[PDB]
Amino acid sequence: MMPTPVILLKEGTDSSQGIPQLVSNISACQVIAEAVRTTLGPRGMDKLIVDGRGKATISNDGATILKLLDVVHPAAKTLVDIAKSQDAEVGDGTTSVTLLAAEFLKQVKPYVEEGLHPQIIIRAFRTATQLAVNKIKEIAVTVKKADKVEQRKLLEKCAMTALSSKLISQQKAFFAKMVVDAVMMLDDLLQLKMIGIKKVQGGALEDSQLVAGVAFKKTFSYAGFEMQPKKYHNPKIALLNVELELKAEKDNAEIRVHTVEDYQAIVDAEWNILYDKLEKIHHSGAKVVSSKLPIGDVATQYFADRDMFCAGRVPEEDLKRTMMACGGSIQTSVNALSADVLGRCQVFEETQIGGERYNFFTGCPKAKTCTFILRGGAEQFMEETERSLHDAIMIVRRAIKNDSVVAGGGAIEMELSKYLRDYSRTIPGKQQLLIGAYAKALEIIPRQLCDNAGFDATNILNKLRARHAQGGTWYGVDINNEDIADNFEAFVWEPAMVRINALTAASEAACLIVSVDETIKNPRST
Amino acid sequence: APVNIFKAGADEERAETARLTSFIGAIAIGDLVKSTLGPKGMDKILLSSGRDASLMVTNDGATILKNIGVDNPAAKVLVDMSRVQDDEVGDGTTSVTVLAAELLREAESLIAKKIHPQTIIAGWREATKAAREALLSSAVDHGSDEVKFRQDLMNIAGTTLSSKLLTHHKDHFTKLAVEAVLRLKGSGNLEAIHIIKKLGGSLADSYLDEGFLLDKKIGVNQPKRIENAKILIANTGMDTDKIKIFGSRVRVDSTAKVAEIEHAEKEKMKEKVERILKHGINCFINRQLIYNYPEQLFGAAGVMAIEHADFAGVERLALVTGGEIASTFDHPELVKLGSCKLIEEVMIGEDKLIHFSGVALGEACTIVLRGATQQILDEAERSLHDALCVLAQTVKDSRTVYGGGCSEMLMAHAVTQLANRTPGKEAVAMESYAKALRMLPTIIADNAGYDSADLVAQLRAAHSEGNTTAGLDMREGTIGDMAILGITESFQVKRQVLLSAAEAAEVILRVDNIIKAAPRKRV
Amino acid sequence: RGKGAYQDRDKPAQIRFSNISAAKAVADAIR
Amino acid sequence: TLAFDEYGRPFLIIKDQDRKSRLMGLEALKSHIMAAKAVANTMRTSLGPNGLDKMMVDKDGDVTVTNDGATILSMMDVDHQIAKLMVELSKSQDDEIGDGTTGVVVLAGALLEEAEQLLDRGIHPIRIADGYEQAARVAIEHLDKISDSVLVDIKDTEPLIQTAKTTLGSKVVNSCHRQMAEIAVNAVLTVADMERRDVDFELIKVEGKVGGRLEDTKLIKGVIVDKDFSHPQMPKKVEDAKIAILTCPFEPPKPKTKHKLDVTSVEDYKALQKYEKEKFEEMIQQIKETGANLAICQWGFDDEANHLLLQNNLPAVRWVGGPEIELIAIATGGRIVPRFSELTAEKLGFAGLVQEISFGTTKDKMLVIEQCKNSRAVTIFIRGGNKMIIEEAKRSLHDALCVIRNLIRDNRVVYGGGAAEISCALAVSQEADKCPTLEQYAMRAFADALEVIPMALSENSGMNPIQTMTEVRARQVKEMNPALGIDCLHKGTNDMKQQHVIETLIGKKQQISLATQMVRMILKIDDIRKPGESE
């Protein structure tokens, strides 16, 4: 009843200010965190979310959950945007980052209600963040056994760990070995665009295969492609961007004829031009001819009578991979074809995996790409499998170039809280209530790694506190025995960068929330 | 009819849907209660639309049908039939319902053969007479030799109860039915055996009270227990007597006279109680309520008084105490008193009741019915009512027939043997009567889950060559001797099932046209 | 031989189970 | 609370939060299992030789009665995200193997049903899912222990015909129990590639025409197309066919580009009239010079061509479709010729008697080829007294063709009739107690679930499942485990070796693996976020 001037300042704008607005902003962050609280750890559960199309997605990755929640609260969006970054920078840093960032605010929530201006909180968050990050660098371990079985084992252990919290139980040795070896097929850019994953329905997880070469799905064909046998033991591959239709035109020409002699000559010329191109393709050995452009009926029969195979309408993404897989080049014009532009492989066959036809290439020793073929009993089943392969490849790619790893589980988070407590007990004044709050939030990881599957959370956390304060700092939470286990000796390792970036992103998220005092929402929304 | 309609808001059906919808709607009644026929049938729950829905679980066809709310004007014919069967004998209500339905089903099939409806009716009349003789010639009599008569009552009680909730409690409730009736030795009032329903304990924990229980606990300032009490019952006024002058006022010059009259008012109430007490009594039951003033006078006299035990409670007490209503007391020497041993109160189901034990000439009893749930209590009560109603008549007409389908096959045999001596125009209808009679042992076997294809063939084959006592053995799934097994039914119950189904069924066959008046109060 | 056969196809085929489920819903309510 | 904060202000997290629903607990898990019971109760009614049919009414009013689970489950209107996955399970089995369209739903349902008690015992939902893997490995390993075959795919096709009889015995075509079993064997073995063990699905075409009876279904060593001779008086019989396959219209050649012929003088007008007449004569004589006596054309004819076809005694048909001319050229050993001027005798097809068949009062004029030369394609011609039995017959023969292909892919078989399922259940039970660390309850639940198949088979066969299961399971232990199953009529004894009940090894291996994986992906869920009303 108060803002009732004779002339309004703006229009109809909502505005909140002060302590209830900060509490509301923190509360929104606590609620959105609920979407991932049960997804952490090897015994996390999956979520089923239905979109407006009626299609469900089943997943447990934070980078897929938070994007489907239809968040509108200005503050809750903060914990989503930081997931967008961690998806690129880290990969594993999804559920753990969201939960820690939310806890950073919960620990100070009971204090921000009664004074304690955010200006002092933000400075303490920055101090504690720098302390925690430096501590990781001082404890991470490396190896000196590069280009030996010791590095292969490191990468395999990184892959088997990366495959945790997926729809994977006994297939870790099956997928992990192929992920490590698939990446070693790449050049020294390790560009992920060189690894394809394709889903073929039918069969179990263990029936998947890693193909050194490429394959295409045999798209729209014409009458005559039931012919051309699919048995080749040493084919050459021509990748062309040439039109092989009779109706190919320049779209701007008109052929004006004044006599019958030229009438027939044009009719014959149109057929002769097509045959000229086909004869130039021949005499090359390119028994396999592929193009992104149509290949018409006349060419299909020409190739059949010449004992050649062709297939058109191949997407550019597969032609580029085919070029890199077969070791050749892609030529647009046929007027300059030679043996020096063709690809080569040993086996080219059309198989029937899952009932659908697939044309596989293999046998090229200079294959810079590969394709992993997934088999499964459902669309969603394979879709979740594909996601598990993308993360495992990402962790292995990074582990090859950065061998600095830390203990998994909550082992590092307990040591970080130990270091911060040792710091805080040497600092006088208000900082004791702020550095400690940062440290206390760090236990959300070993807590949730127990709450989602029992393990007597109260006492097993007390054990971690007793052990880390007296002995080693690599102790975490086992899954098989409901007690403490040494993650270092068990080789439960994660790249050091996962936690370093998690601390940075979680700290910045907190500073974005506590630094806001006012929210202004324009009324114009149509 | 549909062309050139001259009706206001009414309609009619002729020769096309009138009989079709009548047969469908009526025959459906049989299928409803069909599942309740025999010792292995399942029970129904009937639900209301709301407003204290008062859920009822029951087996008996009469209690099912009377709560359905049948709207079809032809189906109502069989509903009323089942009411009459319940009112007359109190048993066989399912059997007569399904028998009439099966007769009607056959009639529709006979119409499809282009048999005139009057020929079908005529054939059923002849077949009915044949069946009546089969029952008359097969009746079993019981006269003297009481050691055999009592066994017959145990067989009749067991048969009726076997079809109700009280299945595996036969060793308790069979005696409660037979002995309660035998103790009456008089008119079948069916009110001299009272049932009190209490929660707590199992059905097997029910028992028969040798005496008589009253409600309305023993007063305020009155003895709680007197040995060798003399009992007086009454139907008189305790207070506000307003003696018989209508339009009389007290009109005085001062309030002193009002106080003096008030004393006179109490003096006459004192005299009234003294006139009752001169009888020499220990226990006083009055239908009308007892007010504060006579309650003190009876207490001071050492005599208990019960107020308003029930409207008919005093009449029931008269029969079990051997006294008289005594609505007026002016000649104590002409008033008969009762006598008992104990008037103590007993605790039954956390409720104190007044127990008159050892009462002379006690031609009445009370059954104390215990159960876990209210649905158990209500269905168990009905089971007692049904068995007592049949027994109260069996002790008057000792003729019985053999059950288990035996009587039904005997009736079907007589109809078949005579139908084959008649010309085809009518024999086809008499045979249909016998076919309906044989549906009853078929339904009984089918509800239990027995191979009726063999039980019916074996039972008919048995009765084709003597074996006039053969019937269904519902324990093993075979054919047995009804006399040895002890499976019998009251003659009157079986007679009425035969006659009622035949008489009611004709009502439907005679109708070719239904005229339906315009409805009222439907908007 | 199977010594007989009986086809049970009627409304009780579902009630015999529906009544049990309703009772379970309350039985667990106060667990 | 949502839409109300402790300060009296609205509290809004996600768009239209008041129209959402979330319930996690154990209720998401019980809801998933309960919904699966509704699915299992459907398919269990069509399992075994007495399986009952379903009538499916489509959204447009069309009605078809089928037994094939692929046709039943694919026509559902179920709006439940997990029940939809139960349909995908039957799809994966149909695509890989093509047999167990009923079995994988019944088995997967039993695993979900038996799992219900395990949650109530307090066993972690994921430990249940993992426990099924430990038991499943046992059943799979023993499944491959008992297997033998004498099929060589040369002449000793007796067990191959028997396999087709086992599959077809469940369908509505038992009036042709033998006839269709033999058709299916002959259809595949005449086109299958013995070198690679591959069978190309395009080499067996299935056609049909309403009328007659199932007993009139024949296997034609050739192709069937819609015949429509361009000239109505053209003879309808060719005894020795020399077939020209042409993809050019019988009209004067035209350019594909913009032409716009300029005509100025009368000499130009009249000269063109002559030149065009000659083109009609040349295009026909170019066929006769090759010795051809039957032309089959993708395109139509000009009126001028029909007369020339008559005078040159050259029968031909018109407007034969893409896949029809493709199959004809392959079946007859010929090649498709682009133009008239490219015709040569070397590209002609060779075939025997060519005839068209008239059916009753109709004008269908269907092709029959009597003789062929080393054809690698066959056509099945299905008859029937109504549209429904013919469409079901198409699926019945499809299943028979699929199990033949499966034996060619892998010639290892097992004994059916429930013998494999009961034996697996017994094997898992024996190892379920080696060792009962945590998973004792889960491994036993798996063994019990395996019995859902002989139990449902017993019910549909009219037997009591307790009286039947207790006898067979005892007999398989008291003596060295025979291939002892169950049946409805018993056929004497239940020895599967004497009843010849043959099923494929790779079929059952997929049924166990695919059912197990489907159960896992729907147990490990505890949160469903489905939207409600639009507004």
UniProtKB/Swiss-Prot annotation, chain A:
UniProt keyword terms in alphabetical order: Acetylation, ATP-binding, Chaperone, Cytoplasm, Hydrolase, Isopeptide bond, Methylation, Nucleotide-binding, Ubl conjugation
Keyword Ubl conjugation appears in the UniProt entry: yes
Protein source organism: Homo sapiens
Gene3D superfamilies assigned to the protein according to its UniProt record, in alphabetical order: GroEL, GroEL-like equatorial domain, TCP-1-like chaperonin intermediate domain
Entries under PROSITE patterns matching the protein: TCP1_1, TCP1_2, TCP1_3
Organism lineage: Eukaryota, Metazoa, Chordata, Craniata, Vertebrata
Function of the protein: Component of the chaperonin-containing T-complex (TRiC), a molecular chaperone complex that assists the folding of actin, tubulin and other proteins upon ATP hydrolysis. The TRiC complex mediates the folding of WRAP53/TCAB1, thereby regulating telomere maintenance.
Modified residues (N-acetylmethionine): 1
Documented effect of changing residue 379 to K: Found in a patient with developmental delay, intellectual disability, pyramidal and cerebellar signs, cerebellar vermis hypoplasia and hypoplasia of the corpus callosum; uncertain significance
NCBIfam families found in the cross-reference section: chap_CCT_eta (TIGR02345), thermosome_alpha (NF041082), thermosome_beta (NF041083)
EC number: 3.6.1.-
Annotated localization: Cytoplasm
Annotated disorder: De novo genetic variants in nearly every subunit of the TRiC complex, including CCT7, have been found in individuals with a broad spectrum of brain malformations, and clinical phenotypes ranging from mild to severe epilepsy, developmental delay, intellectual disability, ataxia, and other features of cerebral malfunction.
One function term, GO molecular function aspect: ATP hydrolysis activity
Cross-link (Glycyl lysine isopeptide (Lys-Gly) (interchain with G-Cter in SUMO2)): 430
Residues reported in the UniProt entry to bind ATP: 41, 93, 96, 398, 409, 499
Stated name of the protein: T-complex protein 1 subunit eta
Curated annotation (Swiss-Prot), chain B:
Modified sites of kind Phosphoserine: 54, 254
Annotated positions of the N6-acetyllysine modification: 7, 148, 175
PROSITE patterns: TCP1_1, TCP1_2, TCP1_3
Top-rank lineage group of the source organism: Eukaryota
GO molecular function list: ATP binding; ATP hydrolysis activity; ATP-dependent protein folding chaperone; protein folding chaperone; ubiquitin protein ligase binding; unfolded protein binding
Residues that bind ADP: 38, 92-95, 162-163, 404, 489, 494
EC number: 3.6.1.-
Pfam family of the protein (one): Cpn60_TCP1
Gene3D superfamilies in UniProt: GroEL, GroEL-like equatorial domain, TCP-1-like chaperonin intermediate domain
Residues given in the record as Mg(2+) binding sites: 91
InterPro entries in UniProt: Chap_CCT_beta, Chaperone_TCP-1, Chaperonin_TCP-1_CS, Cpn60/GroEL/TCP-1, GroEL-like_apical_dom_sf, GROEL-like_equatorial_sf, TCP-1-like_intermed_sf, TCP-1_chaperonin
Catalyzed reaction equations: ATP + H2O = ADP + phosphate + H(+)
Binding-site positions, ATP: 38, 92-94, 489, 494
Family: Belongs to the TCP-1 chaperonin family.
Name the UniProt record assigns to this protein: T-complex protein 1 subunit beta
Provenance organism: Homo sapiens
Gene: CCT2
From Swiss-Prot, chain C:
Annotated positions of the Phosphoserine modification: 18
Subcellular location per the Swiss-Prot or TrEMBL entry: Cytoplasm; Melanosome; Cytoplasm, Cytoskeleton, Microtubule organizing center, Centrosome; Cytoplasm, Cytoskeleton, Cilium basal body
N6-acetyllysine modifications at: 3
Post-translational modification Omega-N-methylarginine, affected residues: 1
Subunit (UniProt): Component of the chaperonin-containing T-complex (TRiC), a hexadecamer composed of two identical back-to-back stacked rings enclosing a protein folding chamber. Each ring is made up of eight different subunits: TCP1/CCT1, CCT2, CCT3, CCT4, CCT5, CCT6A/CCT6, CCT7, CCT8. Interacts with PACRG. Interacts with DNAAF4. Interacts with DLEC1.
Function: Component of the chaperonin-containing T-complex (TRiC), a molecular chaperone complex that assists the folding of actin, tubulin and other proteins upon ATP hydrolysis. The TRiC complex mediates the folding of WRAP53/TCAB1, thereby regulating telomere maintenance. As part of the TRiC complex may play a role in the assembly of BBSome, a complex involved in ciliogenesis regulating transports vesicles to the cilia.
Disorder this protein is connected to according to its UniProt record: De novo genetic variants in nearly every subunit of the TRiC complex, including CCT4, have been found in individuals with a broad spectrum of brain malformations, and clinical phenotypes ranging from mild to severe epilepsy, developmental delay, intellectual disability, ataxia, and other features of cerebral malfunction.
Family of this protein: Belongs to the TCP-1 chaperonin family.
From Swiss-Prot, chain D:
Reactions performed catalytically: ATP + H2O = ADP + phosphate + H(+)
EC number, UniProt record: 3.6.1.-
GO cellular component: cell body; centrosome; chaperonin-containing T-complex; cytosol; extracellular exosome; microtubule
GO molecular function, one term: protein folding chaperone
Keywords noted in UniProt: Acetylation, ATP-binding, Chaperone, Cytoplasm, Cytoskeleton, Disease variant, Hydrolase, Isopeptide bond, Neuropathy, Nucleotide-binding, Phosphoprotein, Ubl conjugation
Binding site for ATP: 48, 101-102, 417
Protein name: T-complex protein 1 subunit epsilon
Species the sequence originates in: Homo sapiens (Human)
Upper taxonomic lineage: Eukaryota, Metazoa, Chordata, Craniata, Vertebrata
